[PDB]
Design a protein around this ligand. Structure first.
Ligand SMILES: Nc1ncnc2c1ncn2[C@@H]1O[C@H](COP(=O)(O)OP(=O)(O)OC[C@H]2O[C@@H](O)[C@H](O)[C@@H]2O)[C@@H](O)[C@H]1O
Length: 176
């Protein structure tokens, strides 16, 4: 349906709808998609390559301007650029944590999700789509990533009084 298998739906604390779906993040037409990247904001990751192909060269200039001013996106932190030719309006870039330390990696992933949602909310983003951050090149076990991200999303809306965000999509991905 519209590029995706729709697996489940849940209502969150402030009336958000959380969908778990399976498909290609870059085919989501919403306000923002979330790009798991590193401190240089490259598109070298698995998702990142697909985002860069769908967005086109325009996205490069915005990333370059940001990196020219800031030099680094710190781990777990987020930054936003236009999505250019992507179906989605914005890209929320997050410096994805590595699964170097199972004992602290889930805390870092939780914080990454919360930082992405926080930043999206300041931009009045209404719909946002997350891939399984960390579980590709950064080696999170898939089930630990899913559980941690889904719990982080629910907890974010438990922790605030108001939000512009109305739907969150968690996008699972099978293979190329
Ligand atoms: N088009 C896609 N849509 C949705 N999910 C996808 C897609 N393509 C791959 N995935 C899945 O997204 C998840 C994250 O994979 P990565 O893109 O490799 O992200 P991550 O594990 O967070 O590593 C970040 C990567 O970016 C680099 O700059 C950094 O050094 C690291 O290599 C994986 O489960 C992967 O199967």
């Amino acid at each position: 349906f519209q590029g995706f298998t729709i697996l489940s739906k849940k209502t969150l604390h402030l009336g958000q709808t959380l969908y778990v779906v399976n498909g290609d993040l870059t085919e989501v037409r919403c306000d923002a998609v979330v790009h798991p990247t590193n401190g240089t904001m490259s598109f070298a990751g698995q998702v990142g390559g697909a985002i860069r192909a769908a967005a086109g060269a325009g996205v490069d200039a915005e990333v370059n301007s940001y990196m020219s001013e800031h030099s680094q996106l710190q781990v777990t932190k987020a930054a936003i650029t236009s999505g250019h030719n992507l179906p989605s309006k914005w890209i929320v870039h997050v410096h994805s944590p590595n699964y170097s330390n199972a004992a602290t990696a889930t805390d870092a992933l939780t914080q990454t999700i919360r930082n992405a949602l926080t930043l999206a909310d300041t931009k009045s983003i209404k719909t946002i789509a997350f891939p399984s951050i960390g579980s590709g090149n950064n080696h999170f076990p898939k089930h630990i990533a899913a559980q941690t991200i889904l719990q982080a999303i629910s907890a974010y809306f438990m922790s605030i009084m108001s939000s512009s965000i109305k739907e969150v999509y968690f996008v699972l991905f099978d293979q190329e």
